[PDB]
Symmetry: C3
Subunit: 301 residues, 3 copies
Amino acid sequence: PSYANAVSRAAPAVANLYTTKMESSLGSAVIMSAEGYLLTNNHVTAGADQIIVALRDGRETIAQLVGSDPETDLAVLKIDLKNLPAMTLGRSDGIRTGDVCLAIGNPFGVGQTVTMGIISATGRNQLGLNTYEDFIQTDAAINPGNSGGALVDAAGNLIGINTAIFSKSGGSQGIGFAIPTKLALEVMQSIIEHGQVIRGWLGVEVKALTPELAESLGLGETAGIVVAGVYRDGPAARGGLLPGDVILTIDKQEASDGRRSMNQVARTRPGQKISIVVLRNGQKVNLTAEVGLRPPPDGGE
Amino acid sequence: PSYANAVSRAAPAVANLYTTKMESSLGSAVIMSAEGYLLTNNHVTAGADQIIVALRDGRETIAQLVGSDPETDLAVLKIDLKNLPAMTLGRSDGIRTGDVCLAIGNPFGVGQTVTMGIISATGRNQLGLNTYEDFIQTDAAINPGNSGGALVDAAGNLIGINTAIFSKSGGSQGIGFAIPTKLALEVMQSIIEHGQVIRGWLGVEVKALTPELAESLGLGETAGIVVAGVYRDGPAARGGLLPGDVILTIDKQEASDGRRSMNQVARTRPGQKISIVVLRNGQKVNLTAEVGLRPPPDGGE
Amino acid sequence: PSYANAVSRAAPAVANLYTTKMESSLGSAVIMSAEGYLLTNNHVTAGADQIIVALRDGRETIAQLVGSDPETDLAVLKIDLKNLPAMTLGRSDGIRTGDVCLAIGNPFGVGQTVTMGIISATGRNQLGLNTYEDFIQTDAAINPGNSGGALVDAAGNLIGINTAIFSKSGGSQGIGFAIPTKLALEVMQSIIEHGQVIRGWLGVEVKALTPELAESLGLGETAGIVVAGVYRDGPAARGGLLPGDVILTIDKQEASDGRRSMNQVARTRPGQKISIVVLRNGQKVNLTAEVGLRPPPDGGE
């Protein structure tokens, strides 16, 4: 049929980013509210000395950088303009593979461009682009210049911020990646509020069972987070875990997935303490621990 | 759903071009009428010593070159065959970004190929491929061998002639460009009639305000075509404009856009004269001028 | 609209192939029946010393290789697992160019991936990838890692096994190729039964009229298979055909197309004999001949 109505709704709220540093770079950004806050990638505006925002209706203006979060590759901007169009929000949770989506951006500086595809996959982590990833995968053509633009559903509602691609040729081969809205709103709100995103710290480093040793004290591969390693300071080595310890629950929640344990720990405010039960030599042992702060640290492959 | 009905309507009127020069090249062409006239790109048939047309139903024949227009990258051909299928025409004006479209061509000589996408953008000029550009942008996969084939809407009606692509890899990365039908019919009809396209000549060369000097005698950036440069002969330097002059109206029409002024001047028949009012030192001055002829002069990036 | 329902139906029956040889390789495979038989490409599992099958629901298991057929680039596998989901079958015959289709695979090892396109063309032979080709062409993004996965119609029914691509860049440029289901079932059933595919042998090698000599004894290019060449042993040179002979019918069937004559001969069981009438010097001559066995012998361009 036609996706023009979706385009008409959403394209006004997607902007072209021109940045100058010390040299010149292109990207995209999404207008989140009529008050002038804009969402984009960190690798678009990082180190810029000047950010110009060019809107679909032709106005241009310099943008102020509210703040940035490199661990998710997001950044926030504020512009002083009246009568701004604002993107409507979709539900990242409600999307399904095979749903149709639209990417809106400035690929190769050609101008605002709409590309069409489907959701290829949801929840892509383990990719190796950012510390925290819940990537939406799409086959809508996404190219250098699409960063920070909008991935939008068939009705025009924002489902993601286009950030990266996997490609052998430096341009689209049908495998592109967008940060889900629900994740991007979380990051956007703290930045707007605290100029950054505050995460919690915990020494432990973990891996899967690979259950030859874990076959010992055998279970169905249920609720076991294997521990390997510790770190230099503000450590969780002084709360009771050791290399080889295995964690059934963190803050009374299953350690089935090591990705989830990253998330809970980041969302626990710095300066607090917490309880983890790991299985040592065949019996549940109970620990409790503090919470440190996390220290400070489009894209191809 | 399915675009097969669209394919069934349109594909019979799209032909495979094989050309030999002095060596061998592939392209596509569109059958515009049952009398055997065919539309294609200039860079497909330019310098060919022999053009073969192969139709979907298997017939082949040598084509005669009616004429060509390199400034838009169009060419016209005539074949002697009976019972030719003819492409139906869509309205280039009525297309909207997000509308679905189909590209029909011979990419890499693989054979007639249908690809599907959306209109990514309309009215693309400033690209740097041709002197006169009103490009439709699509993300339907377009590759070398697609030149001169049909961009068609969801019902099968011709909206454009696929001509070029932007790509880092020598093949499709989702950014392809088609010449709108309405423009291609204009060029097609004079070629068929006068063996070429006759345009009008005028010395002036222009640019935008960049209103630091124009901020002087300030206006809203309204109806001002900045002049910079003049040319060697049949000049419009002998009608009254000078470097630095600024033009509010050409032939009683606004100079808001320098692209439009190119178009009016090309469409004014050679041997006539015309009136332009530019703003000199703060007051409207009125000039009038003659019209010279324009002298004589798929694609990647 | 949305293809999610199609994805939900089909994706459970598409598996990720990891193979180790002597080193490591990725591909895809399709679960054809609840008894654990799987279809994939030959170039994915050929020479593997170990094949792991990873299902959408997370189970993994080593696969046994039933057998393989390199002349079509198909291979078959058997896994020992209960409650397997099974792909539903579409009709390769009923597909039309422009129909929507979905490709399901593991491109670049990113994980199970759904891409969307249309049927670009059907019946692609002469490509030069395999001896026997009836390729479905699609513009659904297909990349290295998609081999042996499912090309599926808009309702979720298998129409093809994704096997190859044409590309200048080592990744998708919109021209991908799937083996039709109807062909793949034929190959699958003999492999499952006889561990291989048994074809018949016949010396002759043929080409088109190119009717300068054939213009002699002129006909409409109807039912004429030109002969050129013969072979080393178990030949059909001892049944009566010679270089230059022209064949009107094979086994009382028209030689209009040399591709069809390949097919009839392969499908004639070894050890039998057959009748071919070729036109020699202007009169139909009738031969009859035996049938030899055929001897033994994702992908880019």
